[PDB]
Amino acid sequence: NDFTPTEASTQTINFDERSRWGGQLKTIMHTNMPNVNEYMFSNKFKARV
Amino acid sequence: EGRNSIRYSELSPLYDTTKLYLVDNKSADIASLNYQNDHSNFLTTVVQNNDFTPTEASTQTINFDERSRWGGQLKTIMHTNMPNVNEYMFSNKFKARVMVSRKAPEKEDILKYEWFEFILPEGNFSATMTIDLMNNAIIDNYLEIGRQNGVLESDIGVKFDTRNFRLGWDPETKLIMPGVYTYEAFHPDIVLLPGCGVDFTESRLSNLLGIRKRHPFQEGFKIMYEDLEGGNIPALLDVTAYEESKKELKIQPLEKDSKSRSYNVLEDKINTAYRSWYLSYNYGNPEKGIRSWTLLTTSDVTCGAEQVYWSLPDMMQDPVTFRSTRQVNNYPVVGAELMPVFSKSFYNEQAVYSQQLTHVFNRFPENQILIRPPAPTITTVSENVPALTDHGTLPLRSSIRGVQRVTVTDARRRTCPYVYKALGIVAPRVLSSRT
Amino acid sequence: EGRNSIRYSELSPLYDTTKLYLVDNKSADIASLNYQNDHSNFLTTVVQNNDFTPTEASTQTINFDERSRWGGQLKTIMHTNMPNVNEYMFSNKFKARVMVSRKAPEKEDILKYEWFEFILPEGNFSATMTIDLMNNAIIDNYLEIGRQNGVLESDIGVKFDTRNFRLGWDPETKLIMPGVYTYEAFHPDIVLLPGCGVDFTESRLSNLLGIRKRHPFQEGFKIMYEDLEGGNIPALLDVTAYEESKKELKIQPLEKDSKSRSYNVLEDKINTAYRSWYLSYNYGNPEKGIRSWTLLTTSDVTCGAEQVYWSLPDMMQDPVTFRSTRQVNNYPVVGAELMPVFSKSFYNEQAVYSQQLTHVFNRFPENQILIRPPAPTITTVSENVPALTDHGTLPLRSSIRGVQRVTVTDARRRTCPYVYKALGIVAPRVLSSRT
């Protein structure tokens, strides 16, 4: 918060060459989707009558 | 040798020293880069080529040879135009408590009082004209409010003067024997009536008046009538009814000035109700008196010396303890200087006193307390002088972009609008190795 | 290389030179650190961060790399406001022995004498106004005591003048032929009567008067009537009763000034009892006379040049022979300078002499000895000029705390209350190795 995000976009973090680096990744995620919806194709079917 | 090259991107390399120029009035930069800024926060090109527009120059670089540590000697030219009195420096305002609404009961002449916070014009003035404007600022509010209510001309509340009201004070008569006060200027002074006062907090004109505090770092500055113990102005002698016994002694004071204007004489016939700062400072009790917490000094028409800070945050490395940022509020500092402001003095013969027309700065010519103050024989005025300054050598950045930001700030970290010239010259040299 | 790093406690290290600033008007320091001190003994932060309060900064450190010896070039800015006449510098007092109680016997008019130690007001004045105030200081005590007893106006005892009382002195008449003394100023002068004297010990106004000692380092300075052998002022000619024989010679002196005031003429008719310093210095016996132990010099309106001492006892190492201490009485000295005080001169045409009203500085206008002195054609006045000073390079301490003490002192090791600006800049560089 001395820098705006635009200004931050030009900045860099530099991991020392002469070494190969790796990163362990952890994630948190939380959803809200309903059972029946159009996105997942779960509100339609066909029938001959 | 070897670790001393200076390389532009397509031209012959130089070696071991050059110059860099930071001028502010190149046409191409006037047109494109600088449209919404001023001479104190500007943006210039370090490339002098005119094969390239400044936009194109912004992508170019000057490269000082790694394997060496470089430093730059900095010289500056600066010229200003600021007036003595202005709003930017808080030098055109002050506060005062005065009287309003002198009406009779329904004991004797109940009175109301309040503060008003006056303002005066803007310009570059001597230290005599300033006093006159400060008096007119009060007379105008008098004509605005107190004239239409029941306040009189003999009871105003505040005046600024230059006289010593104790010369000619035989200590058997206990009065002013010539029947008139001395028309000579010694040092400026405040005079007050009961229930009134002055406040120079968030102001600067106290330095012009030569009044200062013994502990400047506390809160602020306020003088009231109840702090001037010992500064009562003595009354005059009644010379008009004096020769009638001298042609067996008639020693009474005066009361009026031939215009039905009271002198605020007290129940006794030795002194008046007007108090004064100079008298209480010189003649009153030094322990239990205002001398214990105030101080007499010379008048400074410049209204205080103040410093400036230079910043070049794309060429120089940040000095110790400074953070890197991109806010104009706090860039890093590469040099400090004083405002190029100086007092100059002049002799004022005048050979003529008490000229009297109805001049606006002498509205009350008959009264010896409300008369226009006398002028000093030494006049003082502020002037701007161009400043040539060497700031020493600072470390440089290894790579230098073609477009640079130049900034000048005041103590409170605000850009000064009264800079209209700012030139910069930088001379790089090797300082050490990194091998 | 390697032994050239500059490390703050959490930020990128610099190398081989930086700057440090020592300003006195940062808001956070005004509020907290500096509440009971002034601009000459103040306390400031060397950290410019505003993530930290100054209290928090006091625990932080700047660390200059051990394995090297560092030194700092010091530059200073300073601006003052002190008046010419003041109590701080012992420039508003002097002593004089005068006469009181002229009563007849019960042989001729027994007389008493004593010392009084006068005082005069405070302000910044020219060298003419100062003389007038010094005269009024004596006239006031006259009106206080001697007027009510039997002392007359023709026998005061002391006066300060500027005239040469020997022009127009035909050595056949042995008197002043024009019947009047020359109204031109040459150099200031003391005039005395018997039994009276002046003492400028523990005072400074002797330098304003241009009178000095040939051996200044002894005890003090005292002039008495019995040391002015040869300075008797000649009497005037009686022109009033001169044309009665010239229309056979009438050459008598005058006795009165048309106001029943004796000239203190002696038994002979060639000279008076008033003595004078200038006459005894120029016309008397140079061996057995006051010229043997006094000296004539120019007037110095500044009342003497005096030096100041800077101290920074948390940044610099102590120079040789100085002890380490924490008393404001004697800190170590890092720089010496002169008070920024300068005389300025002006021309005074005036084209008008002997104006005569009953002006307070001319109470005795008819008498040619007690008349107001004439003014020089060259006026002189004191002024304050800001001082820019380089003090050289001094050794630094390896570790520097974030809060620093800044002190200015006079010769007698007292803080000057007439400093209202003090800026400091320090530029560290490597001087040697310790490896």
Experimental method: cryo-EM
How many contiguous H segments (helices) and E segments (strands) does chain A have? 1, 0
Q: Mutation test of the interface with chain C: which of B214, B321, B338, choosing the one with the most C Cβ atoms within 10 A?
A: B321
The answer to whether C215 is annotated as binding is: yes
Task: Compute the half-sphere exposure of residue B181: CA atoms within 13 Å on the CB side of its CA.
Answer: 22
- Check CB contact under 8 Å for B324 and A7: no
Could you tell me if B46 and B22 are in contact, meaning their C-beta atoms sit under 8 angstroms apart? yes
Q: What residues in A contact B326, CB-CB < 8 Å? A: 2-3, 7
Q: Which residues of B touch A (CB under 8 A)?
A: 323-327
- Tokens representing C365 are 């206008």
CA B64 to chain centre: 46
Of C126, C136, C425, the CB nearest to B336: C425
Shortest CA gap C431–chain B (Å)? 14
Touch between A and C (at least 3 CB pairs under 8 Å): no
Shortest CA gap B322–chain A (Å)? 13
Residue of chain C whose Cα is closest to the Cα of B348: C348
- Check CB contact under 8 Å for C23 and B411: yes
Distance separating alpha carbons of residues B53 and B58, to the nearest angstrom: 9
Q: Which of C32, C140, C126, C41 is nearest to C409 (CA)?
A: C41
Task: Compute the half-sphere exposure of residue C142: CA atoms within 13 Å on the CB side of its CA.
Answer: 18
Could you tell me if B253 and B269 are in contact, meaning their C-beta atoms sit under 8 angstroms apart? yes
Residue with tokens 């007036």: B83
Q: What residues in B contact A7, CB-CB < 8 Å? A: 326
- Pairing between β-strand B110-115 and β-strand B5-7 as defined by DSSP bridges: unpaired
Contacts of B320 (CB under 8 A, 6+ apart): C6, C8, C14, C18, C20, C62
Q: What residues in B contact C420, CB-CB < 8 Å? A: 207, 212, 216, 297, 304-305
* Amino acid, res. B124: N
3-state DSSP percent of chain A in helix, strand and coil, to 5:
10, 0, 90
Q: Which of B401, B394, B403 is nearest to B429 (CA)?
A: B394
Could you tell me if B92 and B85 are in contact, meaning their C-beta atoms sit under 8 angstroms apart? yes
The number of residues making up chain A comes to 49
Angstrom resolution of this structure: 2.4
Q: What residues in C contact B182, CB-CB < 8 Å? A: 360
The number of residues making up chain B comes to 435
The answer to whether C267 is annotated as binding is: no
Torsion angle, alpha carbons of C398, C399, C402, C403, to 10: -70
Distance separating alpha carbons of residues A12 and C207, to the nearest angstrom: 70
Q: What residues in B contact C11, CB-CB < 8 Å? A: 321, 323
Tell me how crowded residue C127 is: count the other CB atoms within 10 A of its CB.
Answer: 24
3-state DSSP percent of chain B in helix, strand and coil, to 5:
10, 30, 55
Q: Which of B139, B159, B147 is nearest to B100 (CA)?
A: B147
Q: Which of C298, C309, C304 is nearest to C82 (CA)?
A: C304
- Tokens representing C245 are 């024989």
Shortest CA gap B72–chain A (Å)? 26
Diameter of chain C by CA atoms? Answer: 107
CA angle B128, B83, B294 (to 5 degrees): 55
| DSSP character at residue B261 | -
Could you tell me if C22 and C45 are in contact, meaning their C-beta atoms sit under 8 angstroms apart? no
Q: Which of B122, B81, B86 is nearest to B339 (CA)?
A: B81
Task: Compute the half-sphere exposure of residue C349: CA atoms within 13 Å on the CB side of its CA.
Answer: 6
Distance separating alpha carbons of residues C185 and B303, to the nearest angstrom: 37
- Check CB contact under 8 Å for C417 and B214: yes
Q: Which of C208, C227, C190, C57 is nearest to C128 (CA)?
A: C208
Distance separating alpha carbons of residues C403 and C314, to the nearest angstrom: 9
- Tokens representing C286 are 């140079």
Is C352 exposed, middle or buried, given 0-12, 13-18 or 19+ CB atoms closer than 10 A?
exposed
Q: From start to end of C145-270, where are the E strands?
A: 158-161, 189-192, 197-199, 211-213, 222-224
Could you tell me if B235 and B176 are in contact, meaning their C-beta atoms sit under 8 angstroms apart? yes
Bridge partners (DSSP) of residue C336 are C309
Which residues in chain A are followed by a discontinuity, with C-to-N distance exceeding 2.5 angstroms? none
Could you tell me if C402 and C68 are in contact, meaning their C-beta atoms sit under 8 angstroms apart? no
Residue with tokens 């910069």: B424
- Check CB contact under 8 Å for B324 and A2: yes
* Amino acid, res. C159: K
Touch between B and A (at least 3 CB pairs under 8 Å): yes
Could you tell me if C32 and C53 are in contact, meaning their C-beta atoms sit under 8 angstroms apart? yes
Q: Which of C73, C79, C80 is nearest to C425 (CA)?
A: C73
Residue with tokens 């409170």: B412
* Amino acid, res. B384: N
Touch between B and C (at least 3 CB pairs under 8 Å): yes
Q: What residues in B contact C1, CB-CB < 8 Å? A: 432-435
3-class secondary-structure state, position B46: coil
The answer to whether C349 is annotated as binding is: yes
Tell me how crowded residue B130 is: count the other CB atoms within 10 A of its CB.
Answer: 24
The number of residues making up chain C comes to 435
Shortest CA gap B136–chain C (Å)? 26
Could you tell me if B424 and B40 are in contact, meaning their C-beta atoms sit under 8 angstroms apart? no
The string of DSSP codes covering A17-35 is TTS---------------S
Is B312 exposed, middle or buried, given 0-12, 13-18 or 19+ CB atoms closer than 10 A?
buried
Distance separating alpha carbons of residues B71 and B66, to the nearest angstrom: 13
Distance separating alpha carbons of residues C102 and C149, to the nearest angstrom: 7
SS (H, E, C) B40-103: CEEEEECCCCCCCCHHHHCCCEEEECCCEEEEEEEEEEEEECCCCECCCCCCCEEEEEEEEEEE
- Pairing between β-strand C68-80 and β-strand C189-192 as defined by DSSP bridges: unpaired
Q: Which of A38, B411, A47, B314 is nearest to C29 (CA)?
A: B411
Could you tell me if B255 and B262 are in contact, meaning their C-beta atoms sit under 8 angstroms apart? yes
Distance separating alpha carbons of residues C118 and C122, to the nearest angstrom: 13
Distance separating alpha carbons of residues B13 and B97, to the nearest angstrom: 71
| DSSP character at residue B395 | E
3-class secondary-structure state, position C394: strand
Residue of chain A whose Cα is closest to the Cα of B329: A2
- Check CB contact under 8 Å for C148 and B172: yes
Residue with tokens 């001087």: C431
Residue with tokens 């002499």: C353
Question: Can you give the C-alpha Rg of chain C in angstroms?
Answer: 31
Is C362 exposed, middle or buried, given 0-12, 13-18 or 19+ CB atoms closer than 10 A?
middle
Q: Which of C334, C396, C434 is nearest to C63 (CA)?
A: C396
Contacts of B346 (CB under 8 A, 6+ apart): B378, B379, B380, B381, C346
Is C105 exposed, middle or buried, given 0-12, 13-18 or 19+ CB atoms closer than 10 A?
exposed
User: Which region, left, alpha or beta, applies to residue A38 given φ > 0 means left and ψ of -120 to 50 means alpha?
Assistant: alpha
Residue with tokens 């932060």: C45
List the chains bordering chain A where 3 or more Cβ pairs fall under 8 Å: B
- Tokens representing C367 are 């008498």
Helices (H), ranges, B170-266: 205-208
- Check CB contact under 8 Å for A3 and B323: no
Distance separating alpha carbons of residues A2 and B30, to the nearest angstrom: 30
Residue with tokens 């028409």: B301
Contacts of B249 (CB under 8 A, 6+ apart): none
Tell me how crowded residue B95 is: count the other CB atoms within 10 A of its CB.
Answer: 16
Q: From start to end of B220-358, where are the E strands?
A: 222-224, 275-276, 294-296, 307-311, 335-338, 341-347
* Amino acid, res. C362: N
Could you tell me if B248 and B341 are in contact, meaning their C-beta atoms sit under 8 angstroms apart? no
Distance separating alpha carbons of residues C435 and C431, to the nearest angstrom: 13
- Tokens representing B163 are 């006289």
Torsion angle, alpha carbons of C9, C10, C16, C19, to 10: -80
Q: From start to end of C133-278, where are the E strands?
A: 158-161, 189-192, 197-199, 211-213, 222-224, 275-276
Residue of chain C whose Cα is closest to the Cα of B376: C125
First-last CA distance in chain A = 66
Q: What residues in A contact B323, CB-CB < 8 Å? A: 2
Helices (H), ranges, B256-297: 277-282
- Tokens representing C261 are 């005031």
Q: Which of B339, B279, B304, B290 is nearest to B206 (CA)?
A: B304
Distance separating alpha carbons of residues C147 and C141, to the nearest angstrom: 9
Q: From start to end of B81-220, where are the E strands?
A: 93-103, 110-115, 118-119, 158-161, 189-192, 197-199, 211-213
Contacts of B149 (CB under 8 A, 6+ apart): B100, B101, B102, B103
Distance separating alpha carbons of residues B111 and B100, to the nearest angstrom: 7
Distance separating alpha carbons of residues B140 and B129, to the nearest angstrom: 16
Bridge partners (DSSP) of residue C337 are C308
CA B262 to chain centre: 36
Distance separating alpha carbons of residues B98 and B146, to the nearest angstrom: 10
Cα C179 to Cα B276, C165, C207, C272, C274: the distances in Å are 47, 12, 33, 14, 17
Of C37, C82, C423, the CB nearest to B217: C37
Q: From start to end of B273-386, where are the E strands?
A: 275-276, 294-296, 307-311, 335-338, 341-347, 378-384
Distance separating alpha carbons of residues B199 and B191, to the nearest angstrom: 14
- Pairing between β-strand C275-276 and β-strand C14-15 as defined by DSSP bridges: unpaired
- Check CB contact under 8 Å for B320 and C6: yes
- Check CB contact under 8 Å for B323 and A7: no
| DSSP character at residue C54 | H
- Pairing between β-strand B5-7 and β-strand B378-384 as defined by DSSP bridges: unpaired
Q: Which of C243, C268, C232 is nearest to C253 (CA)?
A: C268
- Tell me phi and psi for residue C27, to 5 degrees: -65, -45
Bridge partners (DSSP) of residue B393 are B73
Distance separating alpha carbons of residues B222 and B203, to the nearest angstrom: 11
